[PDB]
Amino acid sequence: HNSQFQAMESAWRGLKLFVDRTDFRENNKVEILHVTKDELLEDFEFAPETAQSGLYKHVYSAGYGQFG
């Protein structure tokens, strides 16, 4: 019931509720990215354009913008 424990328990046991329900045999995969919410806006402040950000690398280019 601590603010460091419970916020890091709901953010992780709630993932298990997303893993247990979704049938991974029926063509499903899920990627897990460790950011923090204050880091992510800084990472959009990092690049001059959203098409060169660090989250753009993991959403677009490592996935969708990739051969195969």
Partner: protein, 155 residues
């Protein structure tokens, strides 16, 4: 949790599946989702463009949780004594989903390792307690012999 089976062969190898069983399905490029958000108890010093994304399904969730090393170190309130204004930091190491349970949280707190060991010593007493009625006969002897009793409590 392993069924005893035989070596496989050209003969047929029946194994009572005490289990029942499920099924599976498949698609094209799977509907891949990216769950993003704070999953550990700090802020990592590496920039975002170098850290990686890990793929989790039902079979490898116990290995993704172990290799994350979710180490939660915080100072919480001390309610083990008569002090209200006392605090007691903890040290937690999580490797499985059962490490959230109070059996493994209290096992990682050394102030609570002595209290479960206290309870395990009291559950061990209750079995042979009421079976032999000669225990209360020597409780009065320990009521009589007060000097030799206190010399053995320190041991």
């Amino acid at each position: 949790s392993k069924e005893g089976s035989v070596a496989p062969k050209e003969r047929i190898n029946i194994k009572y599946i005490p289990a029942t069983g499920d099924a599976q399905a498949e698609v094209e490029l799977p509907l891949k989702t990216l769950v993003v958000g704070d999953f550990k108890g700090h802020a990592e010093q590496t920039p975002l463009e170098e850290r990686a994304t890990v793929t989790v399904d039902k079979n490898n969730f116990e290995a993704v949780m172990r290799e994350s090393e979710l180490k939660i170190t915080a100072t919480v309130k001390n309610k083990l004594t008569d002090d209200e204004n006392a605090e007691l930091p903890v040290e937690l190491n999580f490797k499985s989903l059962a490490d959230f349970a109070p059996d493994a949280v209290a096992s990682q707190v050394p102030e609570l390792k002595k209290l479960i060991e206290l309870r395990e010593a009291l559950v061990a007493l209750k079995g042979p307690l009421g079976n032999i009625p000669a225990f209360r006969e020597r409780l009065q002897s320990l009521l009589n012999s007060e000097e030799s009793r206190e010399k053995l409590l320190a041991e």
